[PDB]
Amino acid sequence: DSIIHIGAIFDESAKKDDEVFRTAVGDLNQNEEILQTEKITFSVTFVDGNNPFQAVQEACELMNQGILALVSSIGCTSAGSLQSLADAMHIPHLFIQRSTAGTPRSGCGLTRSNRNDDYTLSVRPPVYLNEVILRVVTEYAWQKFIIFYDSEYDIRGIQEFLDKVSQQGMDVALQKVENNINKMITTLFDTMRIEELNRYRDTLRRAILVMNPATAKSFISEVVETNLVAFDCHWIIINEEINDVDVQELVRRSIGRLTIIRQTFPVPQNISQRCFRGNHRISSTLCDPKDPFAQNMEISNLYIYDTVLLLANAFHKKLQDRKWHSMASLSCIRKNSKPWQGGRSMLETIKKGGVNGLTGDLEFGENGGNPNVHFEILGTGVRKLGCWNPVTGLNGSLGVVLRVVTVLEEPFVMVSENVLGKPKKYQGFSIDVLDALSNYLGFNYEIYVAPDHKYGSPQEDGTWNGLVGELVFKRADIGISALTITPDRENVVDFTTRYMDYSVGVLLRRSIQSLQDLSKQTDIPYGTVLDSAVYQHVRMKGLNPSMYSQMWRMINNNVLESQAGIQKVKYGNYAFVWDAAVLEYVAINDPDCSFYTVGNTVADRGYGIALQHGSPYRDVFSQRILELQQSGDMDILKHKWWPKNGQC
Amino acid sequence: DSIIHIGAIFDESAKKDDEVFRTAVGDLNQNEEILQTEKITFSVTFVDGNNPFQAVQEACELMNQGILALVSSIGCTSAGSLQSLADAMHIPHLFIQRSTAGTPRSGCGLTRSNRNDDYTLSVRPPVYLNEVILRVVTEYAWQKFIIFYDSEYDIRGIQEFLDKVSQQGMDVALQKVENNINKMITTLFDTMRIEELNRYRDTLRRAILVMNPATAKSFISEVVETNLVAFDCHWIIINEEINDVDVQELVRRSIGRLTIIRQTFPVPQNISQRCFRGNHRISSTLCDPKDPFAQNMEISNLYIYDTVLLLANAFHKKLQDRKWHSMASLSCIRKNSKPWQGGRSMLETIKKGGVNGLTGDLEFGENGGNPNVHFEILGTGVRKLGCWNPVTGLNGSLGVVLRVVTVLEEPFVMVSENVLGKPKKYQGFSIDVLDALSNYLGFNYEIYVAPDHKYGSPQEDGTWNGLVGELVFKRADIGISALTITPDRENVVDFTTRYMDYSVGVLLRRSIQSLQDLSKQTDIPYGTVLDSAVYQHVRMKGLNPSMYSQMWRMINNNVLESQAGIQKVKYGNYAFVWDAAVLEYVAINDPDCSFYTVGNTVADRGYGIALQHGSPYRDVFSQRILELQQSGDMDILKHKWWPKNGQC
């Protein structure tokens, strides 16, 4: 004989809320401490969340069955109808808001009729998206950015945030991400001229993604493939429901800096205390983070569980104090439709209840809404940067001299000053990268050139020469130059991150437009320094498995050493293969502007900073090189010596 | 015996929809051509638009009464419940959307369950606000603007427009106008620094008001009083329901350029054809634009009228073809709830109906929505600039030599060049205003100075001297100088618009901060040119009814003529009263930067352009002077000679 019967109305896509609803029911019927001798029965109905009248009709049939409370897991479309019906029939309505397809939640904005008592309790906490996103952009001190939302977001969710940022003078644009992304980026190309397009690419340097993880994944991958974003972009993704499978896929798909903000549930750490809240035992499928279901649980599943646990404890108190109110068979829209007599007392019991659950500590304020909410902050691998909750706000914030061996190369390392009676000064891109590390890390340095001016080749003795050899023999601490990171060099010295990509380019005389064009004509013969790295590099590619075979066939007579190639293209018919960045500087700073550079191969290797093997600074230097890249300052220093302004 | 019974559900603030509903009922019962022998009865219910369950419950009681169709005049809050209920009971639902407090309409975004037939007909046309506002900003070629909406607008109404403008690279900010405006502008002052504030004032030069006329009136008056906007601002107000009383109050309260876009109803012009649509006679209170009620009719009142007229014609056809379907007593949420058998045929009849009404031609498309909508475009007095409708789109778009007499005055009219063997050239602010008129109007001119260098004083003979006298004797056509518009001069010559305000200022030597400070101390004695205009002007104010009395008491010994005042302040203790704009130029272009100017009285009179009495160009010249003011180009020319950059 059942005296406890609860109601459930579910949107059709809430199958997981039903499964956890039933399992929470079974778990409480096994708990002998709560409702020791009385069983809980239920009536579950699935309805179309887009039909508020269907939701009412099926809710009345549950009330006609006779229930103590109505739990609904449905969207804001039918929440207005279920909130006002509950007030009319005096049935406690534990409302769990579901967003469509995992999109970010927006407050229902219900402006519900306050003439009558509010019989609806919002189990889920308030949507603080505008508050959290405001703290993040204030910490990062953003001033111009664009906010993306998918086709399912309710932008009134940011109607306060758009006012706060407009009070603070920020250039904030919005933009819906269509359900057809490939067409959308393709569409942008037609509307905007080439001159206009750069502003969009520049704006996307700081963007905020308010969208479900699915569109977050596709939209990040789509822009990266179309190279609208670069290694300096900083995107913020915020959504309440973003599981770890999405986090790894977002980080794997994205370049640059990415900040993720999602809701977290403060739950015990111990393995024993993970499936126990006091003496209550939880089914392993929901509390064990090593079970596949628990990892695939929706956030709504957690609040469905803690709802039933709170209902049982609200029922347990009412029986103990002997103030119980039996269910009634209520009728809607009848001549004698009468409210549930015991609704008002049942409501006051539930509203003052509190439980420990999967969501954490569930409780209700005086307004009838759950006040507990916690967001974690992730950042790029990926790691936790801090916490946020609406009570504590934001938590977790978001010179020794070293021997430097160089090799002269314009514009990386050059002699800027050499006046009789003064110490030798240097300048260049490699020097500027060294100064930024010296300026931030707070180390000083003394720079000397390799005795033979060589980058370094392995000798038969087993001792390296050139710049690398100096670091082998501990004659220097750091090696700064146009040094490409090679496997051989990594064996003897330890490298940091690449601070720029090294490509093989060709110098032409004022018709060729690429190495491909270069590798198929014979009007202009071409070569590169004999037996040098670039000589071998074009050879090794040609020999083993479609231009490197036709490039090696030609160079293999037409070869030369050192600068002679630059002059050969100047006063002769010849295309010079060499480092593209060195050639690029040559063609830019040509006193007669007689050259242009093509090529720019896919960069197998890139420039690096070598330290003597086992250096304790490699890790920290790699950090600051990464930061200058992911902040764009490299693009400031690259423009100093490689300006595309138009001198030539 | 009644066989025609219709239903009505109204939001409580739809009293005017009920009154016109009943009067439309009486008007059709008098029409002997339509429903010749059968009367129409009705059941009207007023409900809270914020309670969708109350709307259903009271709708079921109307269906239980037995009705052929349900007309509802309510907001989108309860429209979802009434659209799906109608589909379930097969009751044709003529839905009229009401916005809250006259705020701009937004589409209900209902994503209504399409599994079943849609028994709801939207009597009101679709919301084309994003389309109309996009055409207006494209015509005006705006590139940076801010969009204001009141607390009642549903910004998803502009979710497409924000994407189109972001595709087009425009700097578009949004900003809700709080219901407390005085606090809001006061609040802005605290948040933003003085340097930041100018950007907001500069952005408001082009703003769009998407709000009800009430907040439009207060918000325009509030910014003008706080001088956040100036004579060059261009604001666009768009709303579907903006009656003429609002239009005149908006124009009276606003400065600058104002464009108003509102819905218009193409109705016959003739007095006879205003209250007749074929043989149908309309009550005078609704069709007569000279009746006070008809002028105070809501837009929803017009669609309530044409709804009943369409229902009667839909009923008239069904009786004539002998296909009628009698009403049924239907029950909601019952064991045997059954749909109205005759609903499907009644729906198809209504959907293919068409009537001439107050709204114009009412008809329905295949989607079940009214396709007819027309917007008019007003602009500043106020006049109609064009029309817009979604089918035709936008309609209505949005050198003889003259003798010029001048008077030398820096920096208005100055000799720029006077080299032996060349004609005399001139420069200055007054000249630049003349060149802009000569450049646009396409007239040429020859400039000569008044023989005596005088602006002009009335002689005893009755013949003016100076610059005015030349225009009296038709010796010149236009008078360009630092000429203030005086009543005496208006008597003999005709003036155009003021192209700048003339104020009385004081020159000080590097402590006084205003004429008020100036008019209360005696440490520094002060005067202005004897018996000149400024001498009299300070006198006349002092004599009749609090500083002009203390100013006249002092100057009344300390007076001087021409430049002597400037030198007196330079090499002596003395404050010089004179034209503030002439003094301002003097203090700016001081070779030793020894002066500053205070004062800037309220300008009773301002500079003007005089023409010989009865000139046919005064009107057109006044136009181009107005345009340069209301476009800001005067602020470009004023800065040429009065730059606040900081030379001194």
UniProtKB/Swiss-Prot annotation, chains A, B:
Query: What cellular component GO annotations does this protein have?
Result: AMPA glutamate receptor complex; dendritic spine; glutamatergic synapse; ionotropic glutamate receptor complex; membrane; parallel fiber to Purkinje cell synapse; plasma membrane; postsynaptic density membrane
What biological processes does GO assign it? cerebellar granule cell differentiation; excitatory postsynaptic potential; excitatory synapse assembly; heterophilic cell-cell adhesion via plasma membrane cell adhesion molecules; modulation of chemical synaptic transmission; positive regulation of long-term synaptic depression; positive regulation of synapse assembly; prepulse inhibition
Q: What is known of its domains?
A: The PDZ-binding motif mediates interaction with GOPC.
- Where are the Extracellular topological domains? 1-510, 511-648
What is the protein named?
Glutamate receptor ionotropic, delta-2
Q: Which residues lie within the region annotated Interaction with CBLN1 homotrimer?
A: 1-322
| Similarity comment | Belongs to the glutamate-gated ion channel (TC 1.A.10.1) family. GRID2 subfamily.
The species this protein belongs to is Rattus norvegicus
The residues forming a coiled coil are: none
What does the UniProt record say this protein does? Member of the ionotropic glutamate receptor family, which plays a crucial role in synaptic organization and signal transduction in the central nervous system. Although it shares structural features with ionotropic glutamate receptors, does not bind glutamate as a primary ligand. Promotes synaptogenesis and mediates the D-Serine-dependent long term depression signals and AMPA receptor endocytosis of cerebellar parallel fiber-Purkinje cell (PF-PC) synapses through the NRX1B-CBLN1-GRID2 triad complex.
